[PDB]
Symmetry: D2
Subunit: 284 residues, 4 copies
C-alpha cells in the first residue's frame, strides 16, 4: 500500500465544484470507515495515518480524506465555518460513493469535522473515534489559545522551518519522532502560498456569522451513537481538560487516556490506538 496505489479523487458540489483527494484501501472488506486528519501545517491523510491505514485495511474499507485546505484537496481562499464546510464536502463524497451510515475517526480539526457531520447528517454517521478533537473540546483549565495552538498560529503568520519544527515538537511526547526528514516534507507542503492561504482562511472561519457551529461542546448531548474519546495525557494543543464536557454530555461516551502521549495519538501509541479502534468499531 502506497501514497499512489491508494490515491483517489472525487469532485463534489459545495457552492461550486470542489476536488477532494482521499486514500482507499481494504475494498474487499464490508465495513467502511472514514479517517479525518488534524489541522496543523502540512497535515494530510497519508502523512498523518499512513501506517494506521495498512493495519485498519485488514478489517475495514478505509477512506482517508484530505480535508479541504489540506493535502491534494482544493484550497479555496473563502468558505464558511471550517467544520461545517468540511462536513458538507464529506456529505458530497458520501452521496457520490453511495455510502450509508459509516463510522468516523478524526484527530483534532478532523474530530471537529466528524462531530459537525454527525450532528448535521445524524443518519449518515456511525460510531465515532475522536483523538484530541477540536470543536467538542473546551479547555476548562488551560488558557486559550494553548501553547500548541499559538505555535500553529505563529507558523501561519511567520512560515519559517524553525516555527514549523517548534509546532511539531509540542505535538508529540517523544521529540525523536520529529526527524529532519519529517520537518523537510511538512515545511515544503505547509509553506506553499495555497496551503498558507487555506490555513489562514481555516483559522479565521471560527469568528464569522456561523461561529456557533464550532462550539460543538454545546451540542454533543444530541449524539445517540457510541463515541470513543482518545487523549494523550501530555497533549499540549488540545489538553485533556477539553475532554470533560463531551465525556459528561454524550450518553454513550467512553474516554481512553494514554500516559506518555501527545496530540499525535495514532502514531505515538500506534499499536494500542489501532487495537482500540478495531474493537470499538466491531471488528470487520
Amino acid at each position: 500500500l502506497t501514497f499512489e496505489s491508494t490515491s483517489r479523487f472525487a469532485e463534489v458540489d459545495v457552492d461550486g465544484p470542489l476536488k477532494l483527494h482521499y486514500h482507499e484501501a481494504g475494498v474487499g472488506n464490508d465495513q467502511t470507515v472514514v479517517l479525518l486528519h488534524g489541522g496543523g501545517p502540512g497535515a494530510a491523510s497519508w502523512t498523518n495515518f499512513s501506517r494506521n491505514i495498512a493495519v485498519l485495511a485488514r478489517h475495514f474499507h478505509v477512506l482517508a480524506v484530505d480535508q479541504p485546505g489540506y493535502g491534494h484537496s482544493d484550497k479555496r481562499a473563502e468558505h464558511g465555518q471550517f467544520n461545517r464546510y468540511a462536513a458538507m464536502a464529506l456529505k458530497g463524497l458520501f452521496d457520490q460513493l453511495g455510502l450509508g451510515r459509516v463510522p468516523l475517526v478524526g484527530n483534532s480539526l478532523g474530530g471537529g469535522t466528524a462531530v459537525r457531520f454527525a450532528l448535521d447528517y445524524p443518519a449518515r454517521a456511525g460510531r465515532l473515534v475522536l483523538m484530541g478533537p477540536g470543536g467538542l473540546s473546551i479547555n476548562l483549565f488551560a488558557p486559550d489559545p494553548t501553547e500548541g495552538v499559538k505555535r500553529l498560529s505563529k507558523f501561519s503568520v511567520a512560515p519559517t522551518r524553525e516555527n514549523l519544527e517548534a509546532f511539531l515538537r509540542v505535538m508529540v511526547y517523544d521529540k525523536n519522532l520529529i526527524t529532519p526528514e519529517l520537518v523537510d516534507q511538512r515545511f515544503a507542503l505547509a509553506s506553499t502560498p495555497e496551503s498558507l492561504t487555506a490555513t489562514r482562511a481555516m483559522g479565521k472561519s471560527f469568528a464569522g456569522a456561523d461561529f456557533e457551529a464550532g462550539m460543538m461542546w454545546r451540542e454533543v448531548y444530541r449524539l445517540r451513537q457510541p463515541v470513543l474519546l482518545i487523549w494523550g495525557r501530555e497533549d499540549r494543543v488540545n489538553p485533556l481538560d477539553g475532554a470533560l464536557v463531551a465525556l459528561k454530555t454524550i450518553p454513550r461516551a467512553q474516554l481512553h487516556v494514554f500516559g506518555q502521549c501527545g496530540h499525535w495519538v495514532q502514531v505515538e501509541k500506534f499499536d494500542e490506538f489501532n487495537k482500540l479502534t478495531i474493537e470499538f468499531l466491531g471488528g470487520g
Copy 2:
C-alpha cells in the same frame, strides 16, 4: 425589619395575572439589588435571606422576591421552563417598580433565574452574585441526579417531616444549623397542597418544549457583566465541579469557594458572604 414590616405584593402579567410576594428594605438607599432564593421544599425569601436582608439594607435597596411556586407567590399547576417563567415574572416586577439595570443575587434555582433574566433581558440585569447556581452549573464529575437533588425529589413523592429534614441535612455543612424551628417553618410552607402542586409543575417544566432554556451552561458565554460565582466546597446539591464551565466561558467571571460550607452559603458563611457581596456590588 420583620417579615410583616417588609412584606409586599405585586400583580404582574405572565400569560395572565401572577401575584408575587417579596420583601423590601433600605428604601433610604439609591442602589437596588434583587435576591432570589433556592428551589428546596418550603424555600422562600425571608426563611432563606432574612438576616442577609438586614445587613444588605444598610447599603442597598433590597428586594427579596418569593419566586413563583414558592412562599406567598402564586403557585400555578402549569407553566413553561421554570427559569424562563420566573424571569418573565421578575421582568413584570422590574417594569412596575421602574427599575432600570439592577444587580441580582441568587442561590441554586434563583441563580438560574438570575442568569435566565440576564440572558433574556440583557439591559435590565447588572452585576450577578450566584451561589451554587442551578441551570448554568453542569456537574462534570458528579453523577446526576446528585444526592442533594434525589432528596429534593424524594420529598416531592413522600412529603414527610423526615424527608424534609433529610433534604435540609445535605443542604448544609454544619448540621446543627438544621434546628427543629427551621424544619417546622420550612415544613409548614413545603407541605401545603399548592406548594406540592408547584413542585410537580416545576419537574414537568424541565422536560418540556423549551427544556434548553434550563441548560444555561450553553449560553453564559453571552453574559457581558461581572459575575461572582460563590460555592461551598461541601455543596452536595450543586457540587463544586458544576462551576467550571461558567468560570471558563463567562468573560468577567470570578469564583470564590468557601471551605466548611454547603449549599446555603448566605447563612453558613453569613459575614464573609455579606462582605464579598457588598464589595463586589460597589458598596452602595
Copy 3:
C-alpha cells in the same frame, strides 16, 4: 467452573495464623493474575468476579482472593490499616504459592490493596488494573464521604435489608442488576456478627497510627509498571474526580472511562472490561 471446584484455602502468618479463602482456575496457563474484590457489605471473590473468572481463566491462571474480613477468609476484630494488613496477607499467600511477579486486578478496597502491595513489595507486583479504586483515589470535587460511602456506613451501623439494598442500588447504573436473589444472599453474608465486626474494624482502620498508608494518592508517583485505571462515569461510591491525581502522577498510567456504568465495572461492562484486561495484561 463453580464456587466449589475453584474453592481453595491457605494459612499464612500475619501476627499469627490467618486463613485466606481464594478461587483458582486456568492452572494450565503460564501467566498468573490476582483478582481483589471491593469492600461493600457481603462482597467476596466469587460473587464479585464469578463470571469474569471463567472468561479470564481461558488466558491466565486466576487467583481470586477473599480479602481478610470477607467471604470465607478469617474475620479478625483487630488489625492495622486495612490495605497494609490485606497487602501483608497477600504477600504471605504469594510466598506460600511460590509466585514471582504477578499482575493484580482490584476494584475499590481491592484496588487500594493492590496499590499498597505494589508500593510495599515493588518486585512482586506486575501491571495493575484498578476499577474505581480506594486509597489512590482523592475526590477533588465530591464532598466526602460520598453518597455511596454513606450508604456503606449506614448499613454497618443499621444492618437492615433496606440499607443493604440502598447500597447495592448506588453501586450500579442499571438498577435491574439488583435482583431480590442478589439482595437475599448479600444480606445473609453481610449481616452475620463476624462480617459486621470485620466491616467496622476495616472502616475504623483508616483513622489509626498508620493512617498515611491509606493516602496512596501521595505515593503512586513511585509506581514504575503500567497501570490501567478503569472508571464507570456514573460511579457514586468512588466518583471519577478521584482518578485525576493517579492519572497525572503514575508515569505509565492509562484511564478508561465507561459511560452508563457505575462502581461494579467488571459486571456492568462485563465484555468490554474482560477485553481491556486480557489485552493490557498481554494475552496469556
Copy 4:
C-alpha cells in the same frame, strides 16, 4: 515610601551566614505580614510588590523579603531544596525581629516557601494568602513543564532581553503591563552572573536528596490555619488546575479566581487583591 527608605538587611544563619535584603513599612502598625515574591528571572520584593507595600502598610507592619537567590539577598552557588532553604532563612529572620506567629503572602515560588515554612515551623506561621503558589500546586491537566515554566528555563540557558520579555509576556493577561522600563529593571537583576548562578543552583535543588520537600500537595492536609488560594484564571505558569488538591485537602481553604488575570495577581488585579488580603488577614 521608596526602595531606599524601606531597604533593610539582616544576616541570618543557614549552614553559615546568609544576608537577606527586605523592605519594611507600617512600623506604626501592630500586626506584621511577610510578602514573598515569585521565582521569575529578576524577581524581587520591590519590583513585584512595591505598590501593594504602600497600600498594605496603611493597615499592617509589612516585611517584603528578597528570597535567597533573588534581589539583593545572598546568591549561593549550592543549597538544598529551595523552599526548605528559603524557609530556614525566613525562620532566622523571624527569630532576629522577635516575630511570633505572622501571616504570609506569597506568589508562585514564594507561595511554596510560605507553605514550607508553615509546615516546618507550624507555630510561627498565621493565615496564608497564596497567589498561584508553586510546590503545593500540581497541574492535573497541564503537561509539565507548562509554557510559562519552559520560558523560565529558556532564559536560564539563553539570558537575552528577548527571552526575558517572552517570560514576562506569559506571566500576565494584559501584555501592556510589560513596559520597556519593567523589562529593563527585571533584566538588570536577571542577567548578573550571581543571579544566573542562583537560577542553576535552584534547578539542581529540585532533583536532589530532599526533592519531596518541594511536593507540598502531599503535605498541605497538615495545615491548621486559614489559607486563601488566589488564582488568575489565565495563569500560564501555574495554571488553575494546580489549585484543586490544595483546595480539597487544606481544611480551612478558600479559593478566589480572577478572570482576566495571569500569574502576577497582586498587580494585574491590584485593588481587588489588596481588599481581599486586608479583609482575610483581619484588617489590621
